[PDB]
Design a protein around this motif. Structure first.
Motif, PDB file in Angstrom:
ATOM      1  N   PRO A 207       0.844  -1.191   0.000  1.00  0.00           N
ATOM      2  CA  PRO A 207       0.000   0.000   0.000  1.00  0.00           C
ATOM      3  C   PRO A 207       0.875   1.235   0.000  1.00  0.00           C
ATOM      4  N   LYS A 208       0.289   2.337  -0.449  1.00  0.00           N
ATOM      5  CA  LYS A 208       0.917   3.653  -0.507  1.00  0.00           C
ATOM      6  C   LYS A 208       1.927   3.749  -1.640  1.00  0.00           C
ATOM      7  N   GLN A 209       2.216   2.638  -2.294  1.00  0.00           N
ATOM      8  CA  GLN A 209       2.667   2.685  -3.668  1.00  0.00           C
ATOM      9  C   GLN A 209       1.727   1.934  -4.592  1.00  0.00           C
ATOM     10  N   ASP A 210       0.770   1.183  -4.037  1.00  0.00           N
ATOM     11  CA  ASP A 210      -0.334   0.564  -4.771  1.00  0.00           C
ATOM     12  C   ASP A 210       0.155  -0.450  -5.793  1.00  0.00           C
ATOM     13  N   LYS A 211       1.050  -1.322  -5.348  1.00  0.00           N
ATOM     14  CA  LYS A 211       1.598  -2.389  -6.162  1.00  0.00           C
ATOM     15  C   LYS A 211       1.426  -3.705  -5.426  1.00  0.00           C
ATOM     16  N   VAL A 212       1.719  -4.800  -6.120  1.00  0.00           N
ATOM     17  CA  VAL A 212       1.501  -6.127  -5.566  1.00  0.00           C
ATOM     18  C   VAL A 212       2.399  -7.113  -6.297  1.00  0.00           C
ATOM     19  N   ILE A 213       2.950  -8.066  -5.551  1.00  0.00           N
ATOM     20  CA  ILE A 213       3.772  -9.142  -6.097  1.00  0.00           C
ATOM     21  C   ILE A 213       2.923 -10.391  -6.200  1.00  0.00           C
ATOM     22  N   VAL A 214       2.880 -10.986  -7.383  1.00  0.00           N
ATOM     23  CA  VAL A 214       2.035 -12.138  -7.662  1.00  0.00           C
ATOM     24  C   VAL A 214       2.942 -13.296  -8.046  1.00  0.00           C
ATOM     25  N   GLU A 215       2.569 -14.511  -7.655  1.00  0.00           N
ATOM     26  CA  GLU A 215       3.489 -15.629  -7.821  1.00  0.00           C
ATOM     27  C   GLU A 215       3.584 -16.050  -9.282  1.00  0.00           C
ATOM     28  N   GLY A 216       4.777 -15.882  -9.849  1.00  0.00           N
ATOM     29  CA  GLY A 216       5.104 -16.348 -11.179  1.00  0.00           C
ATOM     30  C   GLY A 216       4.706 -15.432 -12.307  1.00  0.00           C
ATOM     31  N   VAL A 217       4.690 -14.115 -12.085  1.00  0.00           N
ATOM     32  CA  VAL A 217       3.927 -13.207 -12.926  1.00  0.00           C
ATOM     33  C   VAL A 217       4.795 -12.172 -13.628  1.00  0.00           C
ATOM     34  N   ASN A 218       5.783 -11.603 -12.962  1.00  0.00           N
ATOM     35  CA  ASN A 218       6.520 -10.501 -13.584  1.00  0.00           C
ATOM     36  C   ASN A 218       8.020 -10.765 -13.539  1.00  0.00           C
ATOM     37  N   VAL A 219       8.410 -11.952 -14.007  1.00  0.00           N
ATOM     38  CA  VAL A 219       9.764 -12.461 -13.821  1.00  0.00           C
ATOM     39  C   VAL A 219      10.796 -11.534 -14.455  1.00  0.00           C
ATOM     40  N   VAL A 220      11.895 -11.322 -13.735  1.00  0.00           N
ATOM     41  CA  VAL A 220      12.944 -10.376 -14.087  1.00  0.00           C
ATOM     42  C   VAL A 220      14.273 -11.093 -13.889  1.00  0.00           C
ATOM     43  N   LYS A 221      15.306 -10.637 -14.594  1.00  0.00           N
ATOM     44  CA  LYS A 221      16.629 -11.264 -14.558  1.00  0.00           C
ATOM     45  C   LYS A 221      17.670 -10.262 -14.069  1.00  0.00           C
ATOM     46  N   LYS A 222      18.232 -10.506 -12.891  1.00  0.00           N
ATOM     47  CA  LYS A 222      19.221  -9.614 -12.308  1.00  0.00           C
ATOM     48  C   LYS A 222      20.628 -10.099 -12.630  1.00  0.00           C
ATOM     49  N   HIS A 223      21.617  -9.373 -12.110  1.00  0.00           N
ATOM     50  CA  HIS A 223      23.022  -9.746 -12.250  1.00  0.00           C
ATOM     51  C   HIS A 223      23.731  -9.312 -10.974  1.00  0.00           C
ATOM     52  N   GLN A 224      23.992 -10.259 -10.081  1.00  0.00           N
ATOM     53  CA  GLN A 224      24.558  -9.965  -8.776  1.00  0.00           C
ATOM     54  C   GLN A 224      26.018 -10.390  -8.692  1.00  0.00           C
ATOM     55  N   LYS A 225      26.746  -9.699  -7.915  1.00  0.00           N
ATOM     56  CA  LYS A 225      28.080 -10.075  -7.492  1.00  0.00           C
ATOM     57  C   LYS A 225      28.027 -10.647  -6.081  1.00  0.00           C
ATOM     58  N   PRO A 226      28.911 -11.602  -5.763  1.00  0.00           N
ATOM     59  CA  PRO A 226      28.846 -12.296  -4.466  1.00  0.00           C
ATOM     60  C   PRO A 226      28.673 -11.411  -3.235  1.00  0.00           C
ATOM     61  N   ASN A 227      27.609 -11.661  -2.473  1.00  0.00           N
ATOM     62  CA  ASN A 227      27.411 -11.039  -1.173  1.00  0.00           C
ATOM     63  C   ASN A 227      26.726 -12.044  -0.256  1.00  0.00           C
ATOM     64  N   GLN A 228      26.596 -11.674   1.026  1.00  0.00           N
ATOM     65  CA  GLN A 228      26.317 -12.590   2.136  1.00  0.00           C
ATOM     66  C   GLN A 228      25.343 -13.715   1.793  1.00  0.00           C
ATOM     67  N   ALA A 229      24.308 -13.413   1.019  1.00  0.00           N
ATOM     68  CA  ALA A 229      23.421 -14.439   0.490  1.00  0.00           C
ATOM     69  C   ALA A 229      23.860 -14.833  -0.919  1.00  0.00           C
ATOM     70  N   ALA A 230      24.059 -16.134  -1.133  1.00  0.00           N
ATOM     71  CA  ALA A 230      24.568 -16.705  -2.381  1.00  0.00           C
ATOM     72  C   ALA A 230      25.959 -16.173  -2.697  1.00  0.00           C
ATOM     73  N   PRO A 231      26.991 -16.634  -1.975  1.00  0.00           N
ATOM     74  CA  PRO A 231      28.368 -16.183  -2.244  1.00  0.00           C
ATOM     75  C   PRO A 231      28.836 -16.467  -3.658  1.00  0.00           C
ATOM     76  N   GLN A 232      27.999 -17.143  -4.440  1.00  0.00           N
ATOM     77  CA  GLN A 232      28.151 -17.245  -5.888  1.00  0.00           C
ATOM     78  C   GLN A 232      26.942 -16.551  -6.512  1.00  0.00           C
ATOM     79  N   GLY A 233      27.120 -15.292  -6.890  1.00  0.00           N
ATOM     80  CA  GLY A 233      26.063 -14.471  -7.446  1.00  0.00           C
ATOM     81  C   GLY A 233      25.846 -14.640  -8.933  1.00  0.00           C
ATOM     82  N   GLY A 234      25.052 -15.618  -9.346  1.00  0.00           N
ATOM     83  CA  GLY A 234      24.728 -15.764 -10.747  1.00  0.00           C
ATOM     84  C   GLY A 234      23.634 -14.816 -11.208  1.00  0.00           C
TER      85      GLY A 234
END
Length: 101
Positions: free
Chosen positions: A28-55
RNA sequence: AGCUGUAAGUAAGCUAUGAUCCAGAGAUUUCCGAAUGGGGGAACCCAAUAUCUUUUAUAGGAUAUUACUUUUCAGUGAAUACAUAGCUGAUUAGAGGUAGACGCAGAGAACUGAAACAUCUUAGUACCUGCAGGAAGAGAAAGAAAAUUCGAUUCCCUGAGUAGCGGCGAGCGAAACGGGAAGAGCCCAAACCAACAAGCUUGCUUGUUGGGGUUGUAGGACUCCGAUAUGGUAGUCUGUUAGUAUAGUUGAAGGAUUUGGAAAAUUCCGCUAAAGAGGGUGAAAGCCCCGUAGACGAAAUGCUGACAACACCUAGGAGGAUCCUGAGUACGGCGGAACACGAGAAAUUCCGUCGGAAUCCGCGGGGACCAUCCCGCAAGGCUAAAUACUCCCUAGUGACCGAUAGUGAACCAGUACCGUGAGGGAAAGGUGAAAAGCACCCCGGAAGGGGAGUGAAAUAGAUCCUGAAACCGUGUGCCUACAACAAGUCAAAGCUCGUUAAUGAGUGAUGGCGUGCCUUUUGUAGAAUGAACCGGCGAGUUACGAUUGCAUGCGAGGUUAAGUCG
RNA sequence: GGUGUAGUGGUAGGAGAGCGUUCUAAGGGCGUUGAAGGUCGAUCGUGAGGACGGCUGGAGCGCUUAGAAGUGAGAAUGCCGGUAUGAGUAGCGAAAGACAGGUGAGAAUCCUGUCCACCGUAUGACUAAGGUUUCCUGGGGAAGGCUCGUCCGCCCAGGGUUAGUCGGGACCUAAGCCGAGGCCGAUAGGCGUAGGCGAUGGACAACAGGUUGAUAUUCCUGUACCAGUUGUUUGUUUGA
RNA sequence: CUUCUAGUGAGAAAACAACUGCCCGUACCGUAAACCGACACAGGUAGUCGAGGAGAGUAUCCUAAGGUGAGCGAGCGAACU
RNA sequence: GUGAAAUUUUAGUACCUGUGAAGAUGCAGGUUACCCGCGACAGGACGGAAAGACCCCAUGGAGCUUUACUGUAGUUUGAUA
């Protein structure tokens, strides 16, 4: 916000039109919603505390809340939503034959 | 149903036993500052007196009280005896800020205009100081007039650029009648009569409380009888409800098709409207979301009405013997000012100074002054509304701006910066629909780059929309090392191309002719004046009057102003 | 409409008729099958000016008729911005260095050494103003440093200032200042008595050595001094 | 500070022991690249200490304790300043 | 290695005798001259910097003088409270 965090929902507009899914989070207050399996996006991460192998990773992105519609749990067709006077826990009393959502 | 601001990032947590969030009422509120126990270079320092605490004890900690003036009351009190100055204590109020606004007072310029300048104008304007209020100021006829009158004040229209004033120059400039908004009236002094105290003239002189009494058609006192009722208020933190401001609730109606990354667009076929105002959504939506028209709601606190109580105020007729009706006042001489009125023939209203009335057989005014007639009754107090203004809060509006504009300030701006100081004072908006903000590799210390990936697009990569000119480069078709050139224009071979298709386009050896642009001047290539270049900005407007031409409507007639409903 | 005849240089200045910009209304239109804007072309009209086509660009804009204006730019030694020319030119702010070896991507310029040279009533040591973290340790190299930089008074992260006795207050007063009452004065206010503030002066008890990367009469060691507090060691007349 | 009285006015002198003693400053520069001069600027900045030889000396030249080599360089060795 | 400035209408910017707002790199007639730079000198560009300080005007200012005009603070002399 007329849509809640645990909720089955269908998509009106935008490239996932006609998909269904359970709501995952409400913003609320930005009036958006996350839905399961709906707006899939592809990131590019470098290793950090979660997933020390950032694919190259893929998760959902929040869509705007008016691109969505509630589904009556019992019957299965998308409905506009109205409010009526039950024993006084006012719930969303569905249009399309007056049933509780 | 989520939440712990901006604000990412992580860590710890909270919430369906109701978080977060929203409106009414409370509680807490360091230190400075009028700053007020004393001091001081603001945000610091140093105390006195009581009660309480730490310590065996001193040193240490806490809480209350302690300025100055006024105005009321006790105690103490004296040069000087009686007591008044004084002093101590208790009580009562002030004090400062602002809304860069509006009001009423005190004091009060100059440049400027007069084509110089003294009277005059600018102008009782700007600035400074006092006092306010939600509005202030004025206000209940010693009035306006001229027969036949009207009745407190303020504001608007008109009278009118008139009557006037004026080195009679520049210029200044009324009022009453007539039409409207709003309307409202009241209270004292004095005579007299009582209760008390002093002078006990034991005359009734001084006084304090209460009563009476408020005017010009004169009114009152006083004596005579009637009545002892009836009309009102500009009054209260008193009750009874009604509304209202401050949170909210509910609220109609659409799917497929084509093009796109994505439709609200296109094409079909439907529905809704007391709702087709507006904003958002991956492009342009009555029917997707927030809303809108309509219907509903308040525990609490504050406002405004109405009706109740309580508080106040208000009577006739007659008489005309006597008493009352605002004194260093009205007024006059001298000096100044205010009235549209500059001493003028100068009435009216004020200030300083000196002189100085009358009492109803009276007193003032009708623009010097007198007589007659007419209208009023000064020298005591108060009063709503109709008019002015907006720091601020709510809801809106615009043939107003759109980042050199609009506020100085769209952004952490009265900031950075400048000055000892008072004070002066900027620049600086835009990735994308969504961070999906470039994992991995290669050159390189890094910066930066090349692939590979995201994405509809990266030549949208954070110096991020578009991306003009000056200015700086790289590549090429044609020309150029015997030539004196305001740089072009007209004539023209050779070479190179091939267009909005027509008497085509670029370059050009060689030949004729030819002293920039602007301003100011009798006269300029001017060795007279301005400009480094490119881009942006940057100069006859509006209000109210007067005149002429054109145009329209009425026509010996034409036309309304303020204001009322909208 | 034809045909004749006549005319058509122009500064100050008068008169007529039009072109283009922005916004309002009414009507009829266009647009992701790509609006405005930008760039190129060999196109049209008597002029201001108007079209059509390519490329770029990504969301708005024309036309007709009437209305309203912050409506047109080449010049003011105009104002703001950006960029040239002079030009790779002047200058780089008094003074002695040289070599070896370290570090490093990279060294005339940083580190370590050796010899040489300069000041020495100062260019040495201490302190009051003033500044205000510039001080110490570990990293950095985009900008600052008139060249360079591995370095720094620069940048990032942590850390450092210790008092009965030193200087100031709980002590004193000078000049000057403030001033309860008071006296003066259109307002605002001016002065001044009691009493106070105010050092640059008066008064006033601690020294020598050691220690840190950064403080020392302040910490530590030794031996002191000043003012108080607790305990154990005679008539407030006054000769106590 | 030292005396003298006037003075509300049990009885304090001095031995040992052990205790108490508040607030502000304190880094670093300071004839300077840290202050005043817009600058890492040939200027200005109160006070104390301030050694040797030769000398009257704080003059002069060379030195001690201490400090420093100064933030653009390498060549050439013309006119001219 | 680093890195400014005043200036600037555009410039492919010769000499002599003339002409001309009466002293021309640029206009007429001649004469001379292949293209591009470096170190030097100051004859010209009525060279740059400063909208002449000299002179006159504006019915412009400002400071000063006096037996120029019109006022006035201060001092003095009378009447009256």
């Amino acid at each position: 916000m007329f849509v809640k965090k645990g909720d089955k929902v269908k998509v009106i507009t935008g490239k996932d039109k006609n998909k269904e899914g359970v709501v995952l989070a409400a913003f609320p207050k930005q009036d958006k919603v996350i839905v399961e399996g709906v707006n899939v996006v592809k990131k590019h991460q470098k290793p950090n505390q979660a997933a020390p192998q950032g694919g190259i990773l893929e998760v959902e992105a929040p869509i705007h809340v008016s691109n969505v519609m509630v589904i009556d749990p019992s019957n299965g067709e998308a409905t506009k939503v109205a409010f009526k006077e039950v024993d006084g826990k006012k719930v969303r009393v569905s249009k399309k034959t007056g049933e509780v959502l």
